[PDB]
Amino acid sequence: MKYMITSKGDEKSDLLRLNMIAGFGEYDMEYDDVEPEIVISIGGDGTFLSAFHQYEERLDEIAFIGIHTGHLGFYADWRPAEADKLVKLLAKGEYQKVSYPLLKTTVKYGIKKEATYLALNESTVKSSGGPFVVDVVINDIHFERFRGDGLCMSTPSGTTAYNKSLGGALMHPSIEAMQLTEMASINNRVYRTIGSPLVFPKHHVVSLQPVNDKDFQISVDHLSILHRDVQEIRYEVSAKKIHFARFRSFPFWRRVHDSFIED
Amino acid sequence: MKYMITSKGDEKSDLLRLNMIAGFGEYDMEYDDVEPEIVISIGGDGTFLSAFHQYEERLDEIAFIGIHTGHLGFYADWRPAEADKLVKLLAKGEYQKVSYPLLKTTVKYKEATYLALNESTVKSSGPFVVDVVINDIHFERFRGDGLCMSTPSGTTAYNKSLGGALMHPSIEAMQLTEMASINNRVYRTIGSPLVFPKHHVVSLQPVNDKDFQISVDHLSILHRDVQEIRYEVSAKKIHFARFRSFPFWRRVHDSFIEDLEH
Amino acid sequence: MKYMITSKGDEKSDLLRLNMIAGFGYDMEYDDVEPEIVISIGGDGTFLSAFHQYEERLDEIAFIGIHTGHLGFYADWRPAEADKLVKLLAKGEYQKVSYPLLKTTVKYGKKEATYLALNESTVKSSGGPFVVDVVINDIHFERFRGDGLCMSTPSGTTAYNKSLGGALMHPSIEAMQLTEMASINNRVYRTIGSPLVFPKHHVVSLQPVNDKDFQISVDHLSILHRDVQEIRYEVSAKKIHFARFRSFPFWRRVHDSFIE
Amino acid sequence: KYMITSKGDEKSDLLRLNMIAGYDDVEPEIVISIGGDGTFLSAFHQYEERLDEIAFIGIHTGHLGFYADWRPAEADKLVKLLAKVSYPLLKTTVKKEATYLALNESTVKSSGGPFVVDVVINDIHFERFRGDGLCMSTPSGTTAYNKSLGGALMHPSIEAMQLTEMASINNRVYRTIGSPLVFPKHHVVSLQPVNDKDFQISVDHLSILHRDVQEIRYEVSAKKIHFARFRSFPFWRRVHDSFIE
Ligand SMILES: C#Cc1cccc(CCNC(=O)CSc2nc3c(N)ncnc3n2[C@@H]2O[C@H](CN=[N+]=[N-])[C@@H](O)[C@H]2O)c1
Ligand SMILES: C#Cc1cccc(CCNC(=O)CSc2nc3c(N)ncnc3n2[C@@H]2O[C@H](CN=[N+]=[N-])[C@@H](O)[C@H]2O)c1
Ligand SMILES: C#Cc1cccc(CCNC(=O)CSc2nc3c(N)ncnc3n2[C@@H]2O[C@H](CN=[N+]=[N-])[C@@H](O)[C@H]2O)c1
Ligand SMILES: C#Cc1cccc(CCNC(=O)CSc2nc3c(N)ncnc3n2[C@@H]2O[C@H](CN=[N+]=[N-])[C@@H](O)[C@H]2O)c1
């Protein structure tokens, strides 16, 4: 079927790419980077993030596959020296499809219109100059007034990323939820924050509303653009999910174990 | 229908209790402390925990309701000066039923199963050294005070104090947090709290010591000659009686951030 | 004597400024070149500016902070006490409390640039990952990877340091505290995790790994330093002087900020 | 005028006799601890009144400790060299006043249910605590229980003490600081009960049950522990080799 492959940039990844495209020529595999059904990322998790946003409009018809040319990643689980068996399994169509939840980021302005974003790892909101002060509104109800560096809403699969370094909890990707973590909160008598990471289920909306400043630095999967005149930033579990092609069994907790503890 | 009421022990809880039994005599409510359908807890969260474990065998037919005589609790959501409206609403039978997930604690050596509403902790008796096994696979070797497996509703309890995350009770999962773990060259732990979904089993296995103190929601028992302590999301769920809308996040807000109208 | 006053920018600070400057019209001469008493009106951020404005003549200046807004750790005196301050600052009836400072030294591939910190000095990246080697007293300690590192002053512990999970140190202690900023604690970059408090004559040297362009921030100024070879941290011999009139305990000031 | 303390095992007892050949256990000037840090604490508490006249030396028969710095199979050179670094200590007073001396730290937890006290710093109320307990640590004891509780690691050349929280609920009624607190010399931290007055007071895990407690005072002790320095093992290296491998 219609597949494609993205490469990191180094010689090792570009070399492995051509050999797989060749391999896919021995079967009924058509190379198409416009309407693919299988997107293969070769490199790392950062490379995988690029391949995700490259096809965020066609997430429903694409099963992603990651290959790490360096160290083991949470999205790139396949070793380079396993690409032959990967090609054969991807030719017969002998694989199941596992789906991970995603984060929907909506930013509102002083109405130009509305900007929606999709996060695989997480979405963060910081300031653009001095202090970052917003009001956290959970389900149309005020929860706290934040003051610090920013806030980080993470995906279940993104919990092992920026979320963990910020003190967040590690959630299994089978759980459809989102986790909110604080970034250097001052937490005083005026700006009293919960401190603890917050895990929100489906259909729960976390609305960030400005206080004195409306210029924020919104980052989604490390794409960080400056949004001016912001009126509202909404977080919620997107109905859209990213699909993975499962062949073998690489448990999430083992992948966490092999990454943070020891391999 | 068949109801009952548990009391803390002080006069404030005991006085308010009788006043509800009286009010409920004006309706078709049969007072039964053996086989109730609606259990009312008066006191605090600790009192509510007692009401849960007192009738954990008949969770299937019981809708729990909590009343706090002191400060606002996460299970005791109803204020004393609202007890008048509760009997009226609970007599007509006009209420919805919200269910929260529970934690199943299994100990092996006679195998002992326990059910947790808040959380379950495992400590030593000197040093506490165990092996954390996730789904029949080794994850880490723990060394510290102990480990805490929490329920979503129990995240706002001991879990929060240990630096754990606050999880919404609509999520069927369980959270594992560390209790003062040492992180040196020999015992590298994950550090971060771990949230496990359903059908995921976290097994704690002893190393060079077999005497641990297992604690289950406001309890504490000494288990001797322990070979395995298994954790998993229980199939059993606790049922609450809903009349109005008191969001989970509001009870978190009113507890830790501020309560400006009180 | 030779004094001066800096203002935050809002109407409250400029109004309070003029009202105090008049008040002194005693043997008080307004001088912004060689002052002996610098009064900051606004907030802690305003006070930091007044510190860096006269970081060259720190031995002859006793600072006084007035907060027009919420209570600060440097601007501790309330506006409705500016009346008595003028009289007390006229007799010369005051004692002198000194707080430690942080010395930041940067080396290139050239010379070297030294900086003075009242709150703290942080070193982050300029784009992607921040990877450096933490060297304590010419000895390797760890290889860090995350957002950055924060070396704080005792008086600056109640600022960014606390938000990063750092410990609160009393300003009577001559030391410095190093805290981590979202460090990835994995198998390759194993960091200590816990904040590190270093005494006097102890040098913490941050040395680059693959990148040599860092965003070095001192207190309130954050500039981008290219071709960085070494960043050294140590407790500076220079100290900031305060004019103490009444008794406002440090822990009491911490209580009033975070607990009430 | 020296002496040697042993862990209890044969390996330590064997090494003990071999060093004795190379003695006063009433008026010693040089104390050698053979075993571990826990064993080292016993040798410390055994002579806390004459700490001013004793230079301590630790030898680990097991893993490397922060107090047991000397290797067992290199102890041969030690007798010749033994023929001065000072670390701060913690003073714990319980209210008739009962004084205690801590090398690592002194902790206070409950004895049944909740642990609720009022933290009073220099005769001034700071916060009302509610949780498992509180931990006041020495600079040298920061690498012990203090670190596990999320405390900061301070160098032993600093004369101070660090207070860390143990599972604080930290809510709107019991608002705690959260951050570890470092107090200098002549600073007194007074812990005062609310309802229950029976707590488990622990000094170097010498946990005794104190009934009818009215006040628990913490302050940097004037007495300091002395070590016999022969080589140079930096504190941060000792931290490095332990946690960073
Ligand atoms: C891995 C990595 C990485 C990549 C770039 C930059 C950094 C340090 C500065 N980080 C940022 O400015 C935000 S992104 C980030 N920070 C952190 C952080 N401190 N500890 C863990 N992981 C982080 N992420 C992950 O970086 C990823 C961006 N993609 N890449 N490479 C995001 O998706 C986050 O998951 C770390
Ligand atoms: C609140 C706030 C605030 C103020 C200015 C800027 C920001 C966003 C990012 N902050 C920084 O990059 C460092 S400055 C800073 N951030 C923080 C921080 N997130 N939480 C606490 N306190 C901070 N300081 C204190 O601000 C001082 C400088 N400006 N002021 N005031 C610095 O010394 C810090 O100690 C937040
Ligand atoms: C209530 C209570 C309570 C409060 C403070 C201290 C203690 C004794 C030290 N903690 C324990 O032994 C475990 S129970 C516990 N500790 C903690 C804790 N430190 N901070 C918050 N909440 C805790 N829980 C919660 O209390 C619940 C009620 N138990 N009681 N009493 C227990 O299920 C825990 O969820 C019990
Ligand atoms: C590993 C371990 C360990 C050691 C002792 C006890 C325990 C189980 C429950 N916790 C306690 O009993 C508290 S005593 C303690 N725990 C810890 C701790 N987790 N990590 C560092 N250090 C501690 N201290 C220190 O060790 C020394 C106690 N004796 N020993 N060994 C004392 O100085 C304490 O300050 C676990």
XYZ file of N, CA, C and O in Angstrom, chain B residues 71-72 123 126 143 145 156-158 160-162 179-186 253-259 262, chain D residues 63 109 130-132 143-145 147-149 166-175 205 240-245:
224
model
N -14.299 20.502 58.819
C -13.957 21.112 57.537
C -14.352 20.198 56.381
O -14.568 19.000 56.568
N -14.429 20.772 55.185
C -14.852 20.045 53.992
C -13.940 18.871 53.641
O -12.717 19.005 53.605
N 5.181 -0.599 54.227
C 6.435 -0.198 54.854
C 7.182 -1.386 55.443
O 6.781 -2.536 55.275
N 13.405 -2.279 60.274
C 14.499 -1.460 59.784
C 14.259 -0.960 58.373
O 13.209 -0.385 58.087
N 14.174 1.228 47.708
C 14.772 1.354 49.033
C 14.434 2.704 49.655
O 14.844 3.750 49.153
N 11.335 4.449 52.753
C 10.327 4.254 53.788
C 9.269 3.259 53.325
O 8.892 2.353 54.067
N -6.051 12.763 46.450
C -6.133 13.995 47.224
C -5.803 13.767 48.697
O -5.873 14.692 49.508
N -5.437 12.535 49.040
C -5.136 12.188 50.424
C -3.632 12.085 50.658
O -2.900 13.057 50.478
N -3.181 10.900 51.066
C -1.769 10.657 51.343
C -0.933 10.848 50.082
O 0.212 11.298 50.140
N -1.242 13.016 47.660
C -0.928 14.416 47.394
C 0.223 14.891 48.275
O 1.079 15.660 47.835
N 0.235 14.429 49.521
C 1.264 14.815 50.482
C 2.640 14.273 50.107
O 3.665 14.847 50.480
N 2.659 13.164 49.375
C 3.910 12.535 48.968
C 4.439 13.115 47.662
O 5.475 12.684 47.155
N 7.944 6.756 48.804
C 7.971 7.364 50.128
C 9.403 7.492 50.634
O 9.962 6.543 51.182
N 9.982 8.674 50.435
C 11.338 8.993 50.881
C 12.351 7.960 50.396
O 13.078 7.368 51.194
N 12.392 7.747 49.085
C 13.327 6.801 48.493
C 14.726 7.380 48.338
O 14.886 8.529 47.929
N 15.737 6.585 48.670
C 17.114 6.994 48.435
C 17.442 6.711 46.967
O 17.052 5.676 46.425
N 18.134 7.639 46.318
C 18.502 7.468 44.916
C 20.007 7.515 44.710
O 20.556 8.538 44.303
N 20.669 6.398 44.989
C 22.113 6.311 44.832
C 22.517 5.330 43.738
O 21.703 4.955 42.894
N 23.777 4.914 43.762
C 24.336 4.086 42.701
C 23.775 2.669 42.670
O 23.837 1.995 41.643
N 23.222 2.218 43.790
C 22.710 0.857 43.878
C 21.204 0.767 43.623
O 20.736 -0.146 42.941
N -10.193 22.538 44.995
C -10.004 23.981 45.104
C -10.289 24.488 46.512
O -9.494 25.228 47.090
N -11.432 24.078 47.052
C -11.880 24.526 48.365
C -11.035 23.969 49.506
O -11.065 24.495 50.616
N -10.282 22.910 49.233
C -9.494 22.264 50.274
C -8.086 22.835 50.368
O -7.615 23.158 51.457
N -7.425 22.977 49.225
C -6.017 23.356 49.216
C -5.758 24.810 48.830
O -4.756 25.386 49.253
N -6.636 25.415 48.034
C -6.350 26.774 47.588
C -6.998 27.849 48.464
O -6.306 28.750 48.939
N -8.295 27.706 48.733
C -9.068 28.684 49.509
C -10.556 28.332 49.521
O -11.050 27.627 48.639
N -11.266 28.837 50.525
C -12.721 28.725 50.576
C -13.301 30.055 51.054
O -13.589 30.231 52.238
N -16.421 30.627 53.372
C -16.423 29.950 54.665
C -15.247 30.409 55.520
O -15.431 30.872 56.646
N 29.771 -1.216 52.527
C 29.774 -0.180 51.500
C 30.364 1.123 52.015
O 30.441 1.349 53.223
N 7.790 12.358 64.530
C 6.557 11.931 63.878
C 5.501 11.703 64.949
O 5.733 12.005 66.116
N 0.837 19.709 59.434
C 0.045 18.489 59.540
C 0.497 17.463 58.503
O 0.391 17.696 57.299
N 1.003 16.330 58.979
C 1.477 15.278 58.098
C 2.100 14.124 58.857
O 1.612 13.738 59.918
N 3.185 13.576 58.320
C 3.884 12.478 58.979
C 4.795 12.997 60.082
O 4.795 12.471 61.193
N 22.941 14.181 53.537
C 23.068 13.104 52.562
C 22.356 11.837 53.023
O 22.415 10.805 52.355
N 21.684 11.917 54.168
C 20.988 10.763 54.723
C 19.483 10.862 54.492
O 19.024 10.920 53.350
N 18.720 10.875 55.582
C 17.264 10.944 55.508
C 16.805 12.240 54.852
O 15.790 12.273 54.156
N 18.035 13.948 52.343
C 18.031 13.909 50.885
C 16.819 13.155 50.346
O 16.234 13.542 49.333
N 16.448 12.079 51.031
C 15.318 11.256 50.613
C 14.001 12.013 50.748
O 13.039 11.737 50.033
N 13.968 12.973 51.667
C 12.767 13.763 51.909
C 12.699 14.981 50.992
O 11.766 15.780 51.077
N 7.752 16.130 56.137
C 7.470 14.724 55.874
C 5.994 14.514 55.556
O 5.169 14.422 56.465
N 5.673 14.449 54.267
C 4.308 14.205 53.800
C 3.298 15.189 54.385
O 2.336 14.788 55.039
N 3.523 16.474 54.140
C 2.624 17.519 54.615
C 1.375 17.567 53.745
O 1.455 17.430 52.525
N 0.223 17.774 54.372
C -1.027 17.870 53.631
C -1.103 19.231 52.945
O -1.676 19.355 51.862
N -0.479 20.230 53.570
C -0.405 21.596 53.055
C -1.688 22.091 52.388
O -1.772 22.154 51.162
N -2.681 22.437 53.199
C -3.937 22.966 52.680
C -4.196 24.390 53.164
O -3.288 25.062 53.651
N -5.439 24.844 53.027
C -5.791 26.217 53.374
C -5.814 26.446 54.886
O -5.702 27.580 55.351
N -5.962 25.368 55.649
C -6.014 25.465 57.105
C -4.620 25.199 57.674
O -4.177 25.874 58.605
N -3.926 24.225 57.095
C -2.567 23.901 57.515
C -1.608 24.246 56.382
O -1.122 23.366 55.674
N -1.335 25.538 56.226
C -0.468 26.024 55.158
C 1.007 25.954 55.543
O 1.477 26.736 56.368
N 17.741 7.807 64.488
C 16.854 6.648 64.614
C 16.885 6.032 66.010
O 16.579 4.853 66.181
N 29.387 12.434 45.018
C 29.460 12.026 43.618
C 29.553 10.513 43.460
O 28.830 9.916 42.664
N 30.450 9.903 44.227
C 30.695 8.470 44.141
C 29.514 7.654 44.658
O 29.401 6.462 44.374
N 28.635 8.303 45.413
C 27.505 7.612 46.016
C 26.266 7.638 45.127
O 25.629 6.606 44.916
N 25.929 8.810 44.601
C 24.675 8.961 43.876
C 24.864 9.039 42.363
O 24.000 8.607 41.598
N 25.997 9.589 41.935
C 26.264 9.804 40.516
C 27.142 8.674 39.959
O 27.496 8.665 38.779
N 27.473 7.716 40.824
C 28.382 6.614 40.495
C 29.782 7.143 40.205
O 30.501 6.599 39.367
